[PDB]
Design an enzyme around this catalytic site. Structure first.
Site, PDB file in Angstrom:
ATOM      1  N   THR A1097      41.631  41.723  43.426  1.00 42.93           N
ATOM      2  CA  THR A1097      42.500  41.654  42.389  1.00 42.93           C
ATOM      3  C   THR A1097      43.257  40.276  42.404  1.00 42.93           C
ATOM      4  O   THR A1097      44.252  40.031  41.528  1.00 42.93           O
ATOM      5  CB  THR A1097      43.771  42.475  42.586  1.00 42.93           C
ATOM      6  OG1 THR A1097      44.462  42.220  43.776  1.00 42.93           O
ATOM      7  CG2 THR A1097      43.210  44.155  42.600  1.00 42.93           C
ATOM      8  N   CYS A1098      42.849  39.360  43.389  1.00 41.25           N
ATOM      9  CA  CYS A1098      43.232  37.913  43.190  1.00 41.25           C
ATOM     10  C   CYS A1098      42.714  37.386  42.065  1.00 41.25           C
ATOM     11  O   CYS A1098      43.225  36.166  41.625  1.00 41.25           O
ATOM     12  CB  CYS A1098      43.034  37.452  44.608  1.00 41.25           C
ATOM     13  SG  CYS A1098      43.869  38.150  46.048  1.00 41.25           S
TER      14      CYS A1098
END
Lengths: 1124, 76, 74
Positions: A1097-1098
């Site tokens: 999710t970064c």
């Protein structure tokens, strides 16, 4: 490590090159100071030229690749290796040196793209371009578009071989290559604009067919920063080779520019041509195409002053209108309406020059029977009158020149439509008015006055059934004249059916004689304002007359007259408008309530709007200033009209979206987006003062975007701008740390808010020793505290009490409060304990400090508040009626409505006695058959007045009781809470700044409704990559599933995929970086139907395994998301 | 159906495949008709390479589509 | 597939990647644990450096693969 490269053993050099690699790889310029590049590059070329052993070759080219990343001061020496670099491209022996040599040159083409080109490398890099992998293709096409830049025009023979290759590269789909192909041609045309010879060879028949087919491709393969330089490439062709401009008109450029701007080419001629939302830099270029497809204008005649406006050749196009007269027809009969809509919509300074000047060129080169056919459904007549009366130089001059030519080519029609639209009068006003850069203006003023003098003398020195009817029926709306009812039935017939101008209404005095007809506050009038406003709404709403109020409700039927009246009043606003758009261009107090039962009276809000003068926060001088103040009065009568009657519905006349001024919308939206405005804060003062006083001119997105700029500092406003239009490129802010328990939630919430409202910084929520940090917890915090603030044990809210599923883990649930109509506060009598009260007034101080901090940091809060809660927040509490009880307490309000029928039948038979008051039986039940006393029904510990519970409510105080119900339930019993709620709110952030909004549109300030979840938006915003296409089997199976969620699985998906359970500002398009969908890897022994799509999710991946069916992926997503 | 395969020398061969028949089935057909070990046989179609697991229908190959063949040495 | 990333200081960090992750990903899943931006970093896998558009399956880089990292001096 040098002389190992000079070895005679070929395996010794192969060993020594790998030592020579990692000497330069893991070093840098600081650590490799003194590296002798002057010897290593002749060594590496010599190692490169050993073409028998490819591993000696391969690490040699890797060694020169890395030397510039070690030493940028060494790239001057690397340039000597370019022929040997290309030697491995001319005859490929080892393809992993071929893909290696491209990336050696793609670093060189940033500073030495001529040295490749003088070495003939443009044909060489593109030669085996069919063979390479994608990272090497994107190298060479960026070696191409760098070598297409600094070309002297003698050197066309290099490019000329490569030109059917690059013309095919516009049909590939690799987006970093197509935008490296279009960079090449649009650097050719910028260097072959002085030579029609070569520019006809650059533009093939296929270059103008591919690039034409490139722009129609939805989703746009080009960026919006390249859709400029594709279209601007067509401009420097057509303004220097008219044959290509002829050829573009040959190759159906009409359906291209129709599809780019009219939306979908839907076959029918659209009357409301929908604009695709384009920037104020794309529309300057999609018309400088249309400006240079029609022939150039002369420099003698009426156009002779155009030499001075810019002081700040037998054309084949001219032959084309002769040599093909149907091609000019098929160009203009469709592409004129584009130039119609694009000029009228936007508010650019330089767009409105260029969209104007191409209507000069269309009119001047059409013949007589074309302009009769084209301008047939286009009110250009009234449109010139705005352009005539400008305070600009060029828009007046260009209005004269269209006024000149339209009278020449068509005086049999435009003599009618230049007097009935004010073209005659405004030019006649121009002729009779008297009073380097300082030189040129007065000569234009010298030009205009003479040209206006010639114009009336030639055409309008010679000499209106509707302006008869409108100068007459205006002055039956005088203050001192009883006009009767029919002095508006005429205007109900004039403004609805018959065509009126916007110069008849503007100067028959009709504006000020309806402002003053509705807002007159003297006894010197012949008809009182009660009787006038009920006659007025008999005309424009079909409400009953004074005295004809029937037994039933006031029943609306249709608002179509006042609907039409606003539009023609708003058309008159549009033309008369002259607001500036500053864009920095870049081309004991005796409690009678408690002792007696005397409610304060219903304050009608209408009585503040009905004022003939402007309100004292209007400080802008406007030619249309009187038209605004009619609409503000017309908005108040559209909205608050039920107060004038008794049983009129809470059903406003015209929805507040209809009053949106489509030019004032568009003049605002262009005003809000300029960054030099906001950091300096010098917003134009016409904009704010219109917003608060007349919010109804604007759409909700505008006022919202208006609100987050005016009301804050130099910092939070600009951050709102980058959230919505991310194409600019975030100031210095602060985020002080806190730390929050997941079980001591509410008590720690009130502790963090207690000392973090004072500063103007942002709020940092971070849980007690958990991994997930960032915008994850903070947007989960306000969804937990809002989950917290509906607990039934806090005793704050009305409505029922329902135990729910509690997916957050609080399995007790605490019997949460859920109302069907929304959550309004709880009443307190005088019989409440002073510790039970001051506990509650620390919650509504917190709730006010919550929602105020919910706005300054742009967060959202899911509280399904009732409608009359917001009226108390915008200070409209004094107006609340029995139509606001119905949006809080939907059981009492059936009783209160069915008892005001007794009250309205009380006053019916009182006017005509004591026995009839006893006969009043509501479904057979009298007043005492309810047995109600002065206690609020549903809160029996609250007495309305002193000892009213001992006082039975009878027919002689029912009128007092139905005031006392509605005053305690909506105003009085809830008043102690809100005096802190409006205090806690205002501890940081004043409640005056929320007056841009409405009651029924503050829900969408802090909730939202959530966003687009059909596959068509998903297709344009997700980027399938590294194994997937837009026609892959899983991506076709993914996007069909995402269009079948509820409003929580979408929160689940983004929780897992993006991190946060709600989409950021503007749909998927603002995800930075956007949503990447990679196929997940496995091995040969693994069935992919038994795995879970783990992510990162970064940078927002979705490593999706290709599941075999559609329902298997449907089930694995809900499992992989709920597992945090 | 049938496809086209180019090479770095220039000779174009014609396989006989279907919308089926994965890469290692058909890069074996290279060695069956050119004798080239599949350790180094790269296959490029419209720029993107052809990994071993997927089929030809998964790569959207039409009839007589042009793709390419490329010899690595050992590296990746 | 757990991998390793070694910097200049020997501060060997770990990552929990797939073989289907990219190189700009593990350029920025080390953004989380040092303040050096994704344009000042050169991942090095035994002599070569790594393209910003490849996966890790294509590089044939697997579990326990101790790669390297050098600050690109901007």
């Amino acid at each position: 490590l040098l002389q190992g490269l000079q070895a005679s053993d070929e395996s010794q050099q192969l060993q020594a090159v790998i030592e020579m690699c990692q000497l330069l790889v893991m070093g840098n310029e600081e650590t490799l100071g003194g590296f002798p590049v002057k010897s290593v590059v002749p060594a590496l070329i010599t190692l490169l030229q050993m073409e028998h052993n490819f591993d000696i070759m391969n690490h040699a080219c890797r060694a020169l690749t890395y030397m510039m990343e070690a030493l940028p001061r060494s790239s001057a020496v690397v340039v000597d290796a370019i022929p040997v670099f290309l030697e491995k491209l001319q005859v490929i022996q080892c393809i992993d040196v071929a893909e290696q040599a491209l990336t050696a040159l793609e670093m060189l083409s940033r500073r030495h793209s001529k040295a490749i080109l003088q070495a003939g490398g443009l044909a060489d890099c593109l030669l085996y371009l069919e063979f390479f992998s994608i990272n090497a293709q994107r190298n060479a096409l960026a070696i191409a578009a760098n070598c297409c830049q600094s070309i002297t025009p003698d050197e066309f023979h290099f490019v000329a071989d490569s030109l059917p290759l690059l013309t095919q590269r516009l049909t590939h789909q690799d987006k970093k290559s197509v935008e490296s192909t279009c960079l090449c041609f649009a650097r050719l045309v910028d260097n072959f604009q002085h030579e029609e010879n070569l520019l006809q060879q650059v533009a093939s028949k296929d270059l103008l067919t591919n690039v034409q087919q490139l722009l129609v491709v939805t989703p746009p393969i080009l960026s919006s920063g390249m859709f400029i330089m594709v279209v601007r490439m067509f401009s420097l062709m057509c303004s220097n080779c008219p044959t290509l401009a002829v050829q573009l008109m040959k190759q159906n450029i009409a359906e291209t520019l129709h599809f780019l701007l009219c939306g979908a080419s839907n076959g029918s001629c659209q009357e409301q041509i929908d604009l695709v939302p384009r920037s104020p830099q794309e529309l300057y270029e999609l018309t400088s195409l249309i400006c240079e497809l029609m022939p150039c204008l002369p420099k003698e005649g009426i156009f002779a002053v155009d030499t001075m406006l810019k002081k700040g050749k037998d054309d084949a196009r001219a032959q084309l209108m002769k040599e093909d007269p149907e091609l000019a027809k098929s160009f203009i009969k469709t592409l004129f309406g584009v130039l119609y809509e694009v000029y009228s919509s936007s508010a650019g300074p330089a767009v409105r020059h260029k969209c104007l000047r191409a209507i000069l060129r269309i009119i001047y080169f059409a013949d007589a029977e074309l302009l009769k056919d084209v301008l047939k459904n286009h009110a250009v007549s009234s449109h010139i009158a705005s352009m005539l009366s400008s305070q600009d130089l060029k828009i007046v001059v260009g209005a004269l020149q269209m006024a000149e030519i339209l009278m020449q080519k068509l005086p049999d029609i435009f003599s009618v439509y230049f007097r009935r639209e004010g073209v005659m009068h405004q030019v006649k006003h121009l002729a009779e008015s008297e009073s380097t850069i300082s030189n040129n203006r007065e000569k234009i003023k010298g030009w205009i006055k003479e040209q206006a003098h010639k114009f009336v003398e030639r055409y309008f020195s010679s000499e209106l059934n509707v302006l008869q009817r409108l100068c007459a029926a205006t002055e039956q709306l005088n203050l001192q004249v009883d006009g009767g009812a029919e002095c508006l039935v005429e205007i109900r017939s004039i403004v609805s059916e018959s065509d009126v101008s916007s110069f008849e209404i503007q100067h028959s005095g009709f504006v000020k004689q309806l402002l003053l007809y509705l807002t007159s506050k003297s006894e010197k009038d012949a008809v009182s304002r009660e009787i006038r406003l009920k006659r007025f709404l008999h005309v424009f709403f079909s409400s009953p007359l004074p005295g004809e109020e029937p037994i039933g409700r006031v029943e609306p039927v249709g608002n179509a007259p006042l609907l039409a009246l606003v539009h023609k009043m708003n058309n008159c606003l549009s033309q008369m408008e002259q607001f500036p758009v500053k864009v920095h261009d870049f081309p004991k107090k005796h409690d009678e309530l408690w002792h007696d039962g005397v409610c304060p009276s219903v304050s009608n809000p209408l009585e503040v709007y009905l004022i003939p003068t402007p309100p004292e926060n209007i400080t802008f001088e406007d030619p249309s200033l009187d038209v605004i103040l009619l609409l503000r009065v017309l908005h108040a009568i559209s909205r608050y009209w039920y107060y004038l009657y008794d049983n009129a519905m809470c059903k406003e006349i015209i929805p507040t979206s209809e009053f949106i001024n489509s030019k004032l919308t568009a003049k605002a939206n262009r005003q809000l987006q300029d960054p030099l405005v906001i950091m300096t804060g010098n917003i134009p003062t016409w904009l704010t003062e219109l917003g608060k006083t007349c919010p109804f001119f604007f759409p909700f997105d505008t006022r919202q975007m208006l609100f987050y700029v005016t009301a804050f500092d130099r910092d939070r406003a600009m951050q709102r701008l980058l959230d919505t239009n991310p194409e600019i490129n975030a100031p210095r802010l602060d985020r002080k740390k806190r730390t929050v328990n997941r079980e001591e939630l509410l008590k720690q919430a009130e502790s963090v808010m207690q000392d973090l409202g004072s500063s103007r910084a942002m709020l940092e929520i971070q849980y007690e020793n958990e991994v997930g940090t960032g915008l994850g917890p903070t947007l989960e915090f306000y969804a937990l505290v809002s989950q917290e603030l509906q607990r039934a044990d806090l005793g704050l809210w009305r409505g029922e009490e329902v135990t729910l599923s509690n997916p957050k883990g609080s399995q007790e649930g605490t019997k949460y409060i859920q109302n069907l109509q929304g959550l309004f506060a709880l009443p307190f009598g005088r019989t409440a304990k002073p510790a039970h009260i001051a506990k509650v007034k620390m919650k509504f101080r917190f709730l006010g400090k919550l929602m105020a901090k919910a706005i300054m940091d742009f967060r959202l809060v899911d509280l399904p508040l009732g409608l009359p809660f917001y009226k108390w927040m915008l200070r409209q509490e004094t107006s609340l009626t029995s139509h606001d009880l119905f949006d809080i307490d939907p059981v009492v309000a059936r009783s209160v409505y069915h008892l005001e029928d007794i009250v309205r039948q009380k006053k019916r038979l009182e006017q005509d006695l004591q026995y009839a008051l006893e006969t009043l039986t509501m479904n057979g039940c009298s007043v005492e058959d309810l047995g109600l006393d002065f206690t609020l029904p549903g809160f029996p510990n609250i007495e309305l007045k002193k000892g009213g519970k001992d006082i039975p409510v009878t027919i002689h105080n029912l009128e007092e009781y139905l005031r006392l119900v509605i005053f305690w339930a909506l105003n009085e019993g809830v008043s102690r809470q809100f005096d802190s709620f409006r205090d806690g709110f205002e501890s940081v952030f004043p409640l005056s700044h929320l007056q841009y909004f409405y009651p029924e549109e503050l829900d969408q300030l802090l909730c939202g409704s959530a966003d687009t979840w059909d596959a068509k938006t998903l297709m344009e915003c997700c980027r399938p990559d590294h194994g997937y296409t837009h026609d892959s089997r899983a991506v076709k199976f993914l996007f069909e599933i995402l269009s079948s969620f509820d409003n929580e699985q979408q929160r689940l998906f983004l929780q897992f995929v993006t991190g946060s359970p709600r989409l950021p500002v503007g749909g998927f398009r603002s995800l930075n970086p956007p949503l990447t969908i990679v196929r997940k890897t496995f091995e040969s022994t693994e069935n992919p139907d038994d795995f879970l799509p783990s992510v990162m999710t970064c940078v927002n991946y979705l490593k999706l395994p290709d599941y075999s069916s559609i329902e298997i992926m449907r089930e694995k997503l809900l499992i992989a998301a709920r597992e945090g | 159906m049938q496809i086209f395969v180019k090479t770095l020398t220039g000779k174009t061969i014609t396989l006989e495949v279907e919308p089926s028949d994965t890469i290692e089935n058909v890069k074996a057909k290279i060695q069956d008709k050119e004798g080239i070990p599949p350790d180094q046989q790269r296959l490029i179609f419209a720029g993107k390479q052809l990994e071993d697991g997927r089929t030809l229908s998964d790569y959207n190959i039409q009839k007589e589509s042009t793709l390419h063949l490329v010899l690595r040495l050992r590296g990746g």
